[PDB]
Design a protein around this ligand. Structure first.
Ligand SMILES: Cc1cc(C)n(-c2nccc(Nc3ccc(Cl)cc3)n2)n1
Ligand SMILES: [Ca+2]
Ligand SMILES: [Ca+2]
Lengths: 145, 86
């Protein structure tokens, strides 16, 4: 089931996929979107993504097939464990802590990065005890509460 | 809003499942017969069916992994669509 406001917002979402704005999502458009999210689906996987939603078998996804499909997967779940696992990547000694210095080293060099100033705001919240150490299980629990 | 929450988790793949699953049944039976229902174990026969058994089991593992991959790709697109709910 979907509400009036959700149907309207999902029309806007359909434009994130229908790149040329021709009313249909092709395997080519899904490939571009997936790669823009740092994924690399094969041709068969893109075809499978279309075929699972394509109820009339014309090779593309239209807005009703897209909407019908969103209705089936509305349920969300909390991301606490996955986020904790991402911090664990940077827990060199596997002791449940990342120092404020290591957090800066990570955040100013890896991925999209934060400025040293943004790192300061993050550490001010993360370092609850003011000991220069982040108990990341506790910090993630705080952000997902 | 949704904040940090995310979506809760083919004819060719179906054919890969049915053939691999039938072969798991085939080889489980032939290993069983050749190790427990014979007077004298023929080790060459056991090695042959162990090779066919591991290939069928591993083919089913491969399909299941591909289905998990396809499911997360679909959930990625659903998650992107759900950003418009904010
Ligand atoms: C069991 C199974 C296997 C696949 C692939 N399934 C599936 N389910 C829902 C959607 C979907 N693809 C898709 C297509 C386009 C968009 Cl924009 C978003 C999701 N695919 N389901
Ligand atoms: Ca299009
Ligand atoms: Ca269609």
């Amino acid at each position: 089931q979907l509400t009036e406001e959700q149907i309207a917002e999902f029309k806007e979402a359909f434009s994130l996929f229908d790149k040329d704005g021709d009313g249909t999502i092709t395997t080519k458009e899904l490939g571009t979107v997936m790669r823009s999210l740092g994924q690399n689906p094969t041709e068969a996987e893109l075809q499978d993504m279309i075929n699972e939603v394509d109820a009339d078998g014309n090779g593309t996804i239209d807005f009703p097939e897209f909407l019908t499909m969103m209705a089936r997967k509305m349920k969300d779940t909390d991301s606490e464990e996955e986020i904790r696992e991402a911090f664990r990547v940077f827990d060199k000694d596997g002791n449940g802590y990342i120092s404020a210095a290591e957090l800066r080293h990570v955040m100013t060099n890896l991925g999209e990065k934060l400025t040293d100033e943004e790192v300061d705001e993050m550490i001010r919240e993360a370092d609850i005890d003011g000991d220069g150490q982040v108990n990341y299980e506790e910090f993630v629990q705080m952000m997902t509460a | 809003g949704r904040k940090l929450e995310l979506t809760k988790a083919d004819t060719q793949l179906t054919k890969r499942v049915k053939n691999a699953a039938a072969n798991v049944l085939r080889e489980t039976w032939l290993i069983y017969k050749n190790t427990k229902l014979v007077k004298k174990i023929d080790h060459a026969k056991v090695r042959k069916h162990q090779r066919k058994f591991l290939q069928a089991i591993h083919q089913l593992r491969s399909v299941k992994m591909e289905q998990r991959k396809l499911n997360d790709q679909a959930n990625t697109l659903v998650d992107l669509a759900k950003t418009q709910l904010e």
